[PDB]
Design a protein around this ligand. Structure first.
Ligand SMILES: C[C@@H](CN1CCC(n2c(=O)[nH]c3ccccc32)CC1)NC(=O)c1ccc(F)cc1
Length: 580
């Protein structure tokens, strides 16, 4: 299909039936599959990254220079493969795109990198995509950068000439972004925190690969952004940066048979056109959802008021729940977020300007204010909102220094699942920045199933989508920890079992680690005293390990009353459009 008309959900790309698509949870399998795709490139490699760390390894542990990203791209580039890279140009943030760009272009003359934007702006290029030969395309929330690689283990420690090393995260890759963000990126293989003292912050993300027609659709988005970026500065207008051109479309002859539609967010500054098709697909999929929603997003800033926050994703969830409550349907909404926003800050003393600013708009979407989701549900159903919505986070524990350590599993995913039939994997967070189209540039794909599996829906027979059901059962089985029945996702037996574990796990982590955030600190004056108490994990480690045997999975309830007596807004100069 062509690109003269806008398509479903006002998307530049039409739905591509018969697409072979495969999902990836955590950066382990994603970076490994990316390495396999890079290795078999014959003509072109298209890369967009909000942050690209060149020395990252796509496979672990690192024994050699093989599987290192900048080495692999250098090995394809001089077989004749044209590597075109678009990197977000920061406002020196500390991602240091200048070092990434100069290092990438130093590898081979067949590797060309353009940085955008050059002008001062609050918005960014956020989409993560790698396309090989316009036939294989990777996208999601995973940037080829430090701290993203992780697996089901969610290791908190990395203790054990690359010949005999056994570290999974080398140097700048061993990180805990809340404790301290990156510095000195021109020294990749050196540490910037203490592995013996400070644990890792696990990284949960969801990626996806598509084959065939959607990949050319995604390659056309890159080609549009590329040739448009060629027009943005005099250095890029030279023939040094070649015009990229699409590979005409019916030259299109382990993942599943799907229907995939490519959606994106673009504006005049990011590309030559406007599109908010991710937002459209988000509103529509919520509205047509018949049974449940599984949301796993880094941010959750929604609920329109016309002035501060404009996207109506949260307003679509309240309307969908309020209707299921009036008809008497069985309808669940699972929302999983990182317990803390992703910024450096001392949570022992309140978190900081940036974290509290995000928390303000997080809780405003959830529980605090007239526009919040829960306050509007309680206005129509009272305390029965606990039956329709469940907002949780993740947290795991390990050992370090001879005593148990704990840390939240930073949920960087940007995924939505509806009715075990429809999936949305992309870079778009639930906020105005990623969704409105006018701000950050984003990508997403809508994966609707065609082949179905026998399943259960509230105790009833239900042919569920093969691609979507398998993704949710992977998410549920990991956050819930062998004897569990995960077929039915909306029944009272599972939903009660779900909430019981989210609260019990939340309790145990609070008794043993006294972790933050927590419902036990509703003010800053109370928080000052809560942190002056040493937790049981370090007082009596044998006792702590005893109680930790009762934790099942990583699911912990999201603390709604955490610092609920505080402003959470900064006194400050920064436009509030930055956090919305
Ligand atoms: C852990 C991670 C969290 N961080 C959260 C905000 C996010 N984020 C969006 O989603 N949209 C954004 C738009 C603009 C800027 C940030 C945006 C990025 C991930 N920190 C880094 O990756 C990092 C890298 C280098 C550093 F120096 C410090 C931190």
């Amino acid at each position: 299909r062509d690109f003269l008309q806008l398509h479903r959900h006002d998307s530049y790309a039409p739905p591509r039936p018969g697409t072979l698509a495969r999902w990836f949870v955590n950066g382990a399998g994603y970076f490994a599959a990316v390495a396999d795709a890079i290795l078999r490139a014959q003509e072109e490699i298209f890369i967009t990254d909000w942050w690209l760390s060149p020395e990252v390894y796509l496979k672990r542990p690192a024994h050699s220079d093989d599987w290192r990203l900048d080495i692999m791209l250098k090995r394809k580039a001089e077989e004749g493969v044209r590597v075109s890279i678009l990197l977000f140009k920061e406002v020196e943030l500390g991602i240091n795109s200048g070092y990434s760009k100069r290092a990438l272009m130093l590898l081979h003359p067949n590797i060309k990198v353009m940085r955008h934007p050059d002008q001062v702006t609050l918005w960014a290029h956020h989409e993560k995509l790698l396309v090989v030969d316009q036939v294989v395309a990777f996208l999601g929330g995973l940037d080829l950068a430090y701290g993203r690689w992780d697996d089901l283990h969610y290791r908190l420690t990395d203790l054990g000439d690359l010949s005999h090393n056994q570290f999974f995260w080398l140097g700048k890759d061993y990180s805990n972004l809340i404790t301290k963000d990156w510095v000195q990126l021109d020294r990749p293989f050196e540490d910037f925190i203490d592995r013996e003292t400070t644990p890792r912050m696990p990284w949960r993300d969801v990626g996806v690969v598509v084959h065939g027609l959607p990949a050319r659709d995604l390659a056309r988005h890159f080609i549009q952004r590329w040739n448009f970026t060629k027009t943005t500065k005099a250095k890029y207008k030279t023939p040094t940066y070649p015009y990229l051109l699409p590979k005409s479309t019916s030259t299109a002859n382990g993942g599943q048979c799907t229907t995939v539609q490519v959606l994106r967010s673009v504006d005049r500054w990011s590309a030559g056109t406007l599109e908010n098709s991710i937002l459209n697909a988000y509103l529509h999929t919520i509205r047509e959802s018949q049974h449940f929603l599984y949301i796993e997003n880094q941010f959750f800033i929604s609920c329109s008021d016309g002035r501060t926050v404009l996207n109506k994703v949260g307003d679509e969830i309240v309307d969908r729940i309020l209707k299921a409550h009036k008809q008497g349907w069985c309808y669940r909404v699972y929302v999983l977020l990182p317990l803390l926003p992703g910024f450096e800050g001392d949570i022992s003393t309140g978190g900081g300007n940036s974290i509290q600013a995000i928390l303000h708009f997080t809780y405003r979407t959830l529980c605090r204010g007239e526009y919040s989701i829960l306050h509007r549900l309680k206005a129509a159903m009272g305390t029965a909102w606990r039956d329709y919505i469940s907002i949780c986070g993740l947290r795991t524990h390990g050992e370090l220094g001879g005593h148990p350590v704990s840390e939240l599993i930073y949920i960087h995913s940007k995924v939505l699942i509806a009715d075990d039939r429809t999936v949305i994997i992309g870079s778009a967070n639930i906020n105005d920045r990623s969704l409105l189209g006018k701000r950050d540039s984003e990508l997403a794909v809508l994966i609707e199933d065609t082949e179905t599996e026998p399943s259960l829906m509230n105790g009833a027979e239900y042919q569920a989508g093969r691609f979507a059901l398998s993704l949710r059962k992977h998410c549920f089985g990991v956050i819930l920890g062998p004897d569990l029945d995960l077929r039915d996702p909306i029944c009272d037996d599972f939903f009660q079992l779900w909430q019981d574990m989210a609260e019990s796990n939340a309790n145990i982590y609070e008794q043993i680690f006294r972790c933050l955030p927590s419902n036990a600190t509703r003010s800053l004056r109370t928080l000052r005293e809560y942190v002056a108490v040493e937790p049981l994990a370090t007082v009596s480690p044998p006792l702590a390990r005893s109680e930790l045997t009762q934790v099942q999975g990583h699911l912990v309830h999201f603390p709604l009353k955490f610092l609920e007596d505080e402003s959470l807004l900064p006194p400050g100069m920064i436009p509030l459009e930055v956090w919305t």
